[PDB]
Design a protein around this ligand. Structure first.
Ligand SMILES: [Zn+2]
Ligand SMILES: [Zn+2]
Lengths: 418, 418
């Protein structure tokens, strides 16, 4: 089965990505990027596979995708994206590469590892490299702009973003890495500007989650050219009030990053007072609270949250608060259900490992950190942890049957690829 | 060329003394050289003696020049959370001199000797400034962290300090002056983390001398942002027993500063009862006693110390107590030996001048004042004092020839440099 092979070929590369590339595993940022991405996929034609959207800590702008609906976005995209529709146009562009099976159809002409080595070199700040035909790039722009429009974004954002890539391709000695995987001749641009001119004029406003995502990405995961500049923060202090709340949020982050917690708490207060129930400031409200060993206050606030049952960001934030507060069992009650509902989330497993370690449930601790190692492609290491777990439980027990069964599953993943 | 550089270094420190606000406090200068020499003893290819100087400046900086003279702004105690962070900065400077970066940089150019000295004085004064290449900073970090671990300090304290500097260069509009002299691009920071990660984890607890030094620097020599705040003392009151004793010391110190002598005695009492031979507590107990016109009690406590013949802090403390007690002859006997064994310590020369003033030995007072002026680079003034001293003694006397001989030496020192 091609779709079956593609989905597990994708899982193999995604596991290699987690284990060696610097992915941003932050709950707020990953939930936003996937919520935005899924909103595009839900308006794409002939989607035959699930989709996941990954974020790299890389200041070089690039974007690419491979089998299984897995698209990779560098954090530099938030530095170049002035509006949400520009970032959406890049994801729409990459989503269309997958639906058209461009990378899959290009490979029909040691080889599984040859492609995986290319994928991580493009994602790592340590950079072979894949390239699409300019015909392929035209289909991705043609199909991407229509997904862009049906999703309620500005179609003129795609040519506007392409032109900003061209103005740095000659006003700078460095060709941005995105232009080498996705080449941009003026024909590509003039074709894009023409299509946008022929759709409906639409002025769209970037969501409030976009500016907060842009602030957290550049502020909290700053790296190289990926900074949250004071020039941009002061510029956001003059724009629409969404950018001002985002600008306030960004300085609260940097005040927390520099351990000026009371300075950060007092900056964050007015935004939390206006929106007491949104996850973005709730997330940092606990972060500053635990920075001062006020874990009870973080717990009380999160138990009063409306959407604690539905929002994973809230669920992890409270589990972490229970851990720092000295109640690991309450953290485990949340995380046992959390890890079962999000088996691919390594944040959940790592926190469960912490909770089970604090409870001195060593077999369950080893099994929890085994899942972290399995998600990172460290299957030999995951098997070692579950072997140790299975050696601490009586034979014939279900814990032994379950630990040994999980080892069996990881061995099958292992033999499918060399 | 070592002979030229060590006499040229003497000229610069004389220029520093005369214009920069140096902290000459016996305990602090002894501490910073105790720890500095501890790093030199583990350094390679050391060709020079080493002296470390502390400038009362709330802007963080550090630099070094010819003759193994390292200059450290007192702000370093505000940024240093542990003793190994402080040593990491000192090892960086010691690495600058053993590589002779400033010497090799100045061999390229060739008047000039004074242009470098004006730059050094401007950097030291709170208020044209030397900066190193990226090659120099890499060498100073790589070599420095190896010295830092040979000395038993935490190697991860170097990358942790560097990122602490960057973390408040983005939080504030102010970039720390340390990062202007010692540029910190992210390549350097990534390199520092790399070399530290290659070495094994080391949990070292700071000496109790570090916390008392930090307490005395920020509490007695407070200035601008350098403050011993109640926030700091509360956190030390909650920390380990060394921080608790230092918090007790700092509060006793500030009570003494505010003339709350009886309150200061009750606060220092448990620390001095615990170790009656500790120089930091013996020093403070003297200030408290002299503040209440209790010289006899101060004299008797310091005569009972084991290290009176060995510790320069106790010697100066007891000489000053004898001064306030109306026994200037006994002060002079201590200081005549001290100034002979410590020719470069300006404290000994000043207290000797006070003792000779108290004994009405005018020419001997003037000659002692002259040494203080000569150490501060004010050679004409020192010659003026020795000339007047020579005019109060008989021609052909032994005193006349010595005063005239030292005038000859000082003038001979004047023509070597401009
Ligand atoms: Zn493309
Ligand atoms: Zn340096």
């Amino acid at each position: 089965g091609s779709i079956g092979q593609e989905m597990q070929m994708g899982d193999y590369y995604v596991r290699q990505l987690r284990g060696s590339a610097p992915l941003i595993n932050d709950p707020l940022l990953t939930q936003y990027i996937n919520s935005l991405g899924m909103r595009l996929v839900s308006h794409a034609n002939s989607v035959k596979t699930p989709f996941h959207f990954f974020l790299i800590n890389n200041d070089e702008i690039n974007a690419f995708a491979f089998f299984g609906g897995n698209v990779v976005l560098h954090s530099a995209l938030f530095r170049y994206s002035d509006n949400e529709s520009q970032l959406a146009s890049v994801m729409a562009h990459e989503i269309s590469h997958v639906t058209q099976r461009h990378l899959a159809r290009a490979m029909e002409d040691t080889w599984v590892g040859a492609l995986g080595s290319i994928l991580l070199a493009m994602a790592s700040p340590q950079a072979g490299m894949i390239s699409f035909t300019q015909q392929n790039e035209q289909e991705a722009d043609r199909i991407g702009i229509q997904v862009l429009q049906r999703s309620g974004f500005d179609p003129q954002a795609m040519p506007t973003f392409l032109e900003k890539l061209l103005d740095q391709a000659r006003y700078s000695s460095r060709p941005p890495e995105i232009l080498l995987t996705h080449p941009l001749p003026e024909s590509r641009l003039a074709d894009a500007r023409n299509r946008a001119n022929q759709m409906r004029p639409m002025v769209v406003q970037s969501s409030e989650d976009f500016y907060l995502a842009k602030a957290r990405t550049l502020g909290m995961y700053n790296s190289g050219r990926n900074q949250l500049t004071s020039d941009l923060l002061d510029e956001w202090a003059k724009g629409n009030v969404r950018q001002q709340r985002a600008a306030q949020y960004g300085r609260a982050l940097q005040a927390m990053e520099a351990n000026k917690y009371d300075e950060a708490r007092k900056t964050l207060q007015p935004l939390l007072a206006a929106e007491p129930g949104n996850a973005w400031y709730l997330d940092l409200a606990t972060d500053i609270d635990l920075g001062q060993n006020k874990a009870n206050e973080a717990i009380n606030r999160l138990k009063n949250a409306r959407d604690l049952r539905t929002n994973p960001v809230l669920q992890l934030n409270l589990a972490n608060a229970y851990l720092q507060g000295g109640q690991p069992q309450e953290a485990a009650n949340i995380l046992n259900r959390y890890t079962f509902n999000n088996k691919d989330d390594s944040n959940g497993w790592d926190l469960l490992a912490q909770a089970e370690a604090a409870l001195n449930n060593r077999d369950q601790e080893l099994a929890a950190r085994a899942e972290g190692y399995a998600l990172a492609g460290r299957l030999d290491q995951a098997i070692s942890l579950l072997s140790s777990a299975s050696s601490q439980v009586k034979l014939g027990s279900l814990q032994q049957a379950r630990y040994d069964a999980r080892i069996d599953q990881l061995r099958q993943l292992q033999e499918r690829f060399k």
